Write a protein that binds this DNA or RNA. Structure first.
Ligand SMILES: [Mg+2]
Ligand SMILES: [Mg+2]
Ligand SMILES: [Mg+2]
Ligand SMILES: [Mg+2]
Ligand SMILES: [Mg+2]
Ligand SMILES: [Mg+2]
Ligand SMILES: [Mg+2]
Ligand SMILES: [Mg+2]
Ligand SMILES: [Mg+2]
Ligand SMILES: [Mg+2]
Ligand SMILES: [Mg+2]
Ligand SMILES: [Mg+2]
Ligand SMILES: [Mg+2]
Ligand SMILES: [Mg+2]
Ligand SMILES: [Mg+2]
Ligand SMILES: [Mg+2]
Ligand SMILES: [Mg+2]
Ligand SMILES: [Mg+2]
Ligand SMILES: [Mg+2]
Ligand SMILES: [Mg+2]
Ligand SMILES: [Mg+2]
Ligand SMILES: [Mg+2]
Ligand SMILES: [Mg+2]
Ligand SMILES: [Mg+2]
Ligand SMILES: [Mg+2]
Ligand SMILES: [Mg+2]
Ligand SMILES: [Mg+2]
Ligand SMILES: [Mg+2]
Ligand SMILES: [Mg+2]
Ligand SMILES: [Mg+2]
Ligand SMILES: [Mg+2]
Ligand SMILES: [Mg+2]
Lengths: 122, 127, 106, 197, 167, 48, 111
RNA sequence: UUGGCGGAAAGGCCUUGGGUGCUUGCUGGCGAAUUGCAAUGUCAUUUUGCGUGGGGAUAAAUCAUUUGUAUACGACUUAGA
RNA sequence: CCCUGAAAAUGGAUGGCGCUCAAGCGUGUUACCUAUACUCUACCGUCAGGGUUGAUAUGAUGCCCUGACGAGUAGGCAGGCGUGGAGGUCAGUGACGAAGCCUAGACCGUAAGGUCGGGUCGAACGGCCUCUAGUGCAGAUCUUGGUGGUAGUAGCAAAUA
RNA sequence: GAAUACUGCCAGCUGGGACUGAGGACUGCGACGUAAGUCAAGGAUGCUGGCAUAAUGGUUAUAUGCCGCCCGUCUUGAAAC
RNA sequence: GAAAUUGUUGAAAGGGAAGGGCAUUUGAUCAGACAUGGUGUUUUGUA
């Protein structure tokens, strides 16, 4: 959502030219981060290896008002509320290894080739 | 185990998709014929979709044959299954979707005793 | 021996085609050292193998083979028509292909 | 039959050579062309100069930076004459063009490799005696190519150095011929003569 | 019920095939294949190895020996469609190939239940080969360089044209 | 025309090497230091 | 159409390879002398050679014999038409017209 | 290992000495099989990561501030341990 | 044959490239490339001509033999797919889960469509023979309701602060 | 006095390649043989090998070669500026 | 609790459209056939 906005030099960190400072969104987001961290503390998490594993924002029902246009016409004038939800998680080490054994089927002539190669070699 | 049959040939495996079912969502994929005056599909221009027509009719000796080699039959209760006692080599039973799990168990048990093949011996199986 | 080749080299040129329509079921093959249909008449019925490499393992190798035969000559320059079990992927135009000496006639 | 092919462009026809080369690219044979400034074009010089000028006039009206680029280097003139000979707008064409390298003069390592000529595209074997022909290098400078002097200088250096190579090569082969002559009139050679070698 | 019934059912009885009129008669094999010629293997494990042809077997196959002493190709069965008959001829009179037949070679396929990944030869096959070839090599030793010729392996080079090559 | 080699002087002034840094104040000022080590022998890496 | 005077060989090839009778408004291949016996026994015709003889030697029952034969269905010539362009007279180097006796070469290719 | 030549894209070419394996230039001895009548019967190179143990060196840019030879914003030019 | 005669506007078109004992022009001879065309074969359908009451076993509107044919707007006719409700039947399915909804999971039919698996679901629903109709949607600047791109854009600048 | 060219005929012989295997107790027409019987005679059989698993195959996504103008309508004519 | 439309996760492609038709490569994913009757008892629960 960045059409026809200005540029800034602060976007170089992200390799982008279009960036802004949406304070209102930031305040709400960090409000939930405090709430999630407090919930993490209650559950008994170390509060030091947590990272934002999941986060999403999706539209909420509109809140409509009226705006007044020329020649006595009426147009919609509404807000765009949001449902915000996020999940924190402790960072873990390497998950696992040792995948499937990868069973193989060999033809008879393939079997003879390996036997011959193993016979002429050690 | 099925009755011997010739090789299965269809002449057309692709489902016939309604024109512009990929363009507008409101145009369902169910095949409708294009009745337009200047529609290239109706005029059979080269490079467009092929319309369904009788020339694609499958072989009569092969029509209604499952790849296993049987004709599908829908069964709903134990009594229905007994109509296939002497026709194992041609028909295969299939339990209807609306059959309870307990009633499915007795159906499959009876079919195994009589050697009736079941196309879906996995519906609503708890394991 | 430093050379173990028992096949003659070939290049897949194109499908059978007009200006605007091509037929993938038939392929055109150029055999090295053949410049006339009469010489190419000897090469009919032989087996053709297209050897390409794949990343995933299938059945003990990285190599998968396309098997096919020639059917008849093509043109006055010794080009021949060949057909395969599965048609060549049309990405092999100009790729090298192998033509063996069996079934032999001599 | 060959990994790559190096064609000596001297005495060739730009059109006939391009058609021969273009089919080779479409067949998968890697091609490199050297000495593009000695390609010959049928017709008198002023005739072809007018043709190129008529090609110059054609450009995009509203923005000349996106119009048909009029390359002037002898290799590039050949390249355009060849580029239109291949369906370059397809992935097959783009891969085909990637197998080709057109050069001015005879550059490095290709200078140490054997060069070949195409008999059916040669000027002497294709043009009736008495007809007028052009030299691409002369034409290219008349329309804006800047580096005629340097390629003439380097080719003078290349030809000079190549002379000693052949002078050494010829002298060595003379030893081989003498040794082979002595080795003949022997029992071993008699069977080779009997068997055709 | 879900599906009512089919009124007529197809017959369960299988019908016998018609009396086929395709009798079997032996091959008219190409005249270039003569017992005692030198052949080339175009396929198999021993592909490209120059070898000797002995007898036309009953199951449309050719009895073939290396000789095993020269190059290591034993008494083996091949098909005429995968070999090339050269112009070199070896006089093979005086060898008893009549012992060898289609039943002389059997495989004894193992049961599918027994599958082995770790992994031999029959004594009679060893001595049958040893008797025959040592009788042959008394004849190969006559023509010079042919013993080395059989030990060599056939291979195509650059420039060779099989449609113009001679064998 | 193509440049093939560049041979610099053994010593550089402070002002000239400031061209090579977009932040001179927070820097180690290690400009041509190892190139300076190309000197201190008679002509090995330079005269060649 | 392209037409000419056929030879004995050419008519023999046609009836043997593509010989079909109009039996009860159906196109039945001959393949056997019995079929000709049933439908052409009235006009002294008994064998396929009897049909040929009535054709090459135009007999009293040529009309019945000829009308009995289904029209021949020929393929495109194996060696081609021999001329770059067809629809001009054979005298113009074309295909149609009265190629009087060269039709034997053409029909053999046509069959 | 010795030296020379090559800057057009040199990135290669030639050359000294010694050692080393092979040599079908020529004559001998043994092995090959069962991959069972063919199933490319796998032998090339492209990049990257992870381990070894062996050498080698210890940066800069951006944001923020500042400048105005610059500028709508970006960008440019400056300066600051 | 070629040249003069021969002047128009964006840059340009023997289709392009390019082509000079041609890849040009006049003429002749073959070889070769290919259409849903022609010859042959398989299958589908339609039409036409025929056989087959005999007991047993089903469908006599059934099964089988032979030949020919298959383009198509407006339009005509026929055989079928599906929806709401009605009479009859399967002593049909179903809280041990009906209907509905989702499913680059599966099967059948040329198709209209039919069937199953898997997840949600909680209370009714289906197969066949017939009856009946407010029975099948992409368009009508269609009606009602909902939602996008434009777009975090135009902009939120009179009345001195 | 011949040969050879060209054209045409052979119910003259023979090599190589490609695609198809429909039908399903017998009946018919034939041919070979004194007969038995056999046969290429009203539609393919025989021998052998591998695998029996995503191998073949289906679906789907992508890439490649070629082709492919937006639908409905009025109109002689619609992709229509 | 469907669709238009949207967020996150996962896969894939992307040089002035995308979408489609024929065939195939590659990746992912998916069903069946592999007991048959039978020689037969080298057998257990002895049929
Ligand atoms: Mg913008
Ligand atoms: Mg603005
Ligand atoms: Mg207002
Ligand atoms: Mg008002
Ligand atoms: Mg749609
Ligand atoms: Mg119209
Ligand atoms: Mg032809
Ligand atoms: Mg023509
Ligand atoms: Mg003029
Ligand atoms: Mg042309
Ligand atoms: Mg001409
Ligand atoms: Mg065709
Ligand atoms: Mg969906
Ligand atoms: Mg349910
Ligand atoms: Mg309730
Ligand atoms: Mg209504
Ligand atoms: Mg609608
Ligand atoms: Mg409509
Ligand atoms: Mg509307
Ligand atoms: Mg604004
Ligand atoms: Mg205002
Ligand atoms: Mg003759
Ligand atoms: Mg698969
Ligand atoms: Mg497949
Ligand atoms: Mg696939
Ligand atoms: Mg797609
Ligand atoms: Mg197009
Ligand atoms: Mg009008
Ligand atoms: Mg217009
Ligand atoms: Mg709710
Ligand atoms: Mg949705
Ligand atoms: Mg762009």
């Amino acid at each position: 959502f960045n059409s026809s906005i200005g540029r800034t030099a602060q976007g170089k960190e992200f390799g982008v030219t279009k960036a802004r400072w949406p304070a209102k969104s930031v305040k709400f987001v960090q409000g939930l981060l405090q709430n999630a961290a407090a919930n993490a503390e209650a559950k008994g998490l170390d509060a030091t290896k947590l990272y934002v594993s999941h986060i999403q924002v999706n539209q909420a029902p509109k809140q409509r008002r009226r705006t007044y246009r020329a020649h006595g016409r009426i147009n919609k004038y509404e807000s765009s509320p949001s449902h915000i939800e996020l999940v924190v998680t402790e960072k873990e080490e390497a998950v696992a290894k040792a995948a499937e054994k990868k069973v193989v089927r060999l033809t008879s002539r393939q079997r003879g080739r390996i036997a011959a190669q193993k016979r002429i070699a050690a | 185990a099925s009755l011997p049959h010739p090789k299965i040939v269809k002449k057309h495996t692709k489902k016939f998709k309604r024109h512009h079912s990929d363009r507008y969502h409101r145009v369902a994929e169910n095949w409708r014929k294009q009745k337009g005056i200047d529609s290239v599909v109706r005029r059979r221009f080269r490079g467009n979709i092929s319309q369904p027509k009788i020339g694609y009719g499958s072989n009569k000796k092969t029509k209604f044959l499952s790849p296993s080699g049987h004709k599908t039959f829908l069964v709903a209760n134990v009594k229905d299954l007994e109509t296939l006692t002497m026709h194992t080599k041609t028909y295969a039973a299939e339990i209807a979707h609306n059959i309870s799990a307990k009633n499915r168990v007795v159906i499959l048990a009876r079919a195994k005793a009589l050697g009736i093949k079941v196309t879906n011996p996995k519906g609503r199986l708890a394991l | 021996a430093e050379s173990h080749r028992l096949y003659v080299k070939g290049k897949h040129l194109s499908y059978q085609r007009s200006k605007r329509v091509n037929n993938p079921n038939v392929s055109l093959i150029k055999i090295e050292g053949v410049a006339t249909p009469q010489d190419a008449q000897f090469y009919l019925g032989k087996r053709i193998a297209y050897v390409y490499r794949a990343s995933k393992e299938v059945r003990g190798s990285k190599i998968r083979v396309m098997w096919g035969k020639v059917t008849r000559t093509h043109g006055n320059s010794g080009v021949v028509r060949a057909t395969f079990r599965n048609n060549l992927p049309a990405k092999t135009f100009g790729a090298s292909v192998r033509i063996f000496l069996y079934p032999s006639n001599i | 039959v060959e990994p790559v092919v190096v064609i000596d462009g001297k005495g060739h026809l730009v059109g006939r050579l391009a058609s021969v080369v273009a089919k080779q690219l479409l067949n998968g044979q890697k091609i490199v062309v050297v000495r593009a400034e000695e390609l010959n074009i049928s017709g008198e010089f002023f005739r072809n100069k007018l043709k190129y000028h008529d090609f110059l006039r054609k450009a995009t009206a509203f923005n000349k930076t996106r119009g048909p680029f009029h390359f002037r280097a002898p290799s590039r003139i050949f390249y355009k004459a060849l580029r239109g000979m291949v369906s370059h707008k397809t992935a097959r064409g783009k891969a085909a063009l990637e197998r080709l390298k057109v050069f001015e003069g005879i550059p490095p390592p290709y200078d140490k490799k054997k060069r070949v000529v195409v008999p059916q595209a040669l000027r002497v074997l294709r043009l009736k005696p008495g007809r007028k022909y052009t030299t691409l290098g002369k034409l290219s400078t008349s329309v804006g190519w800047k580096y005629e002097d340097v390629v003439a200088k380097l080719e003078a250096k290349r030809k000079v150095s190549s002379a000693e190579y052949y002078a050494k090569k010829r002298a060595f082969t003379k030893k081989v011929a003498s040794a082979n002559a002595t080795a003949a009139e022997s029992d071993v050679a008699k069977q080779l003569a009997a068997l055709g070698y | 019920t879900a599906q009512q019934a089919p009124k007529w059912y197809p017959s369960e009885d299988v019908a016998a095939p018609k009396k086929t009129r395709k009798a079997v008669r032996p091959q008219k094999l190409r005249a270039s294949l003569v017992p005692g010629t030198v052949l080339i293997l175009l396929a198999g494990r021993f592909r490209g190895k120059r070898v000797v042809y002995l007898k036309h077997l009953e199951d449309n196959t050719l009895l073939v020996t290396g000789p095993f002493k020269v190059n290591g190709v034993p008494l083996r069965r091949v098909n005429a469609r995968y070999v090339i008959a050269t112009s070199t001829k070896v006089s093979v009179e005086g060898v008893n190939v009549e012992k060898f037949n289609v039943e002389y070679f059997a495989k004894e396929k193992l049961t599918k239940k027994e599958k082995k990944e770790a992994n031999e030869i029959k004594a009679e096959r060893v001595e049958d080969q040893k008797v025959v070839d040592k009788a042959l090599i008394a004849e190969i030793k006559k023509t010079p360089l042919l013993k080395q010729y059989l030990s060599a392996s056939f291979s195509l080079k650059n420039g060779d044209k099989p449609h113009m090559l001679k064998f | 025309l193509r440049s093939l080699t560049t041979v610099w002087a053994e010593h550089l002034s402070d002002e000239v090497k400031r061209r090579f840094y977009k932040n001179w104040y927070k820097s180690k000022k290690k400009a041509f230091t190892k190139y300076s080590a190309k000197y201190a022998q008679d002509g090995a890496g330079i005269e060649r | 159409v392209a037409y000419g005077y056929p030879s004995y060989s050419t008519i023999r090839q046609l009836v043997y390879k593509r010989g079909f009778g109009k039996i009860n408004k159906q196109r039945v291949p001959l393949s056997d002398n019995a079929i000709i016996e049933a439908n052409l026994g009235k006009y002294g015709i008994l064998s396929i050679d009897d049909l040929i003889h009535e054709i090459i030697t135009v007999g009293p029952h040529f009309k019945q014999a000829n009308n009995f034969l289904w029209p021949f269905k020929l393929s495109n010539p194996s060696g081609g038409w021999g001329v770059p362009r067809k629809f001009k007279h054979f005298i113009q180097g074309g295909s149609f017209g009265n190629r009087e006796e060269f039709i034997n070469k053409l029909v053999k290719s046509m069959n």
